[PDB]
Symmetry: C3
Subunit: 99 residues, 3 copies
């Protein structure tokens, strides 16, 4: 192809593609939104979300197909755990009593 | 260029509105992004409103600090390090209330 | 009222009104930097990431159910409500709790 993309908007935002490094950049915006009636898919080895306030997944179900790692966990309304569950490195308590 | 505003014959819109600094894609059925390296989003607030499901089909999802959920289902085991406080119900294991 | 871009490296950005499909393909990286918010509103979101998805934020909120294969909690937490464990051993600090036949 021979097309190019470097849109420089009057508010300072930029949308650009650089083919030598194959880098797509969107910068200088306040908000972005995508509204679709079917699906949104991203297929890429690494997804990195740096959100200094919050990431909200407002959905009936979030599915992690393999491992999920978190710093801390808060479960609000119960759940189920199958397989070996290993607690270490502190106290596991239930209704105020240590297990 | 210096502007972006496209209205397609299906009613979709792809635009950038510099007055409010808002990038908008609307009225579409599907979107897909395929990249060989990485996608990064850096922004205070991310909101995904998905009336059916969000699937993270990956070897590992990492939340760097807190994860809050309504309910939890762990299918194939896990490890919990630190102090874990259970309250507000019963803990059952292998068919019996503990 | 159209969008079909093909770059010298083979990447494409296109919108197809017949199927109402937006496609970005053939790129190496994308980066979006915004000062306010990024929102997606759609029934189904699929992230197919052969290495890893990192949510680097003070808080990830799942409003309803979270399902995972395996779980690792690094620095503690709280669980409220009824929790049902099945199909393996429950242990704390190396001590297998007596929840099945020894």
């Amino acid at each position: 192809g021979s097309d190019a993309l470097h849109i420089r908007f009057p508010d300072g935002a930029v949308i650009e593609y650089e083919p030598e490094t194959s880098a797509l950049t969107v910068s200088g915006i306040k908000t972005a939104s995508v509204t679709a009636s079917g699906s949104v898919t991203a297929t890429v080895p690494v997804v990195m979300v740096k959100a200094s306030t919050r990431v909200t997944l407002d959905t009936p179900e979030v599915v992690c197909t393999n491992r999920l790692i978190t710093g801390t966990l808060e479960v609000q309304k119960g759940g189920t755990m199958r397989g070996n569950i290993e607690h270490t490195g502190g106290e596991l308590s239930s209704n105020g009593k240590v297990l």
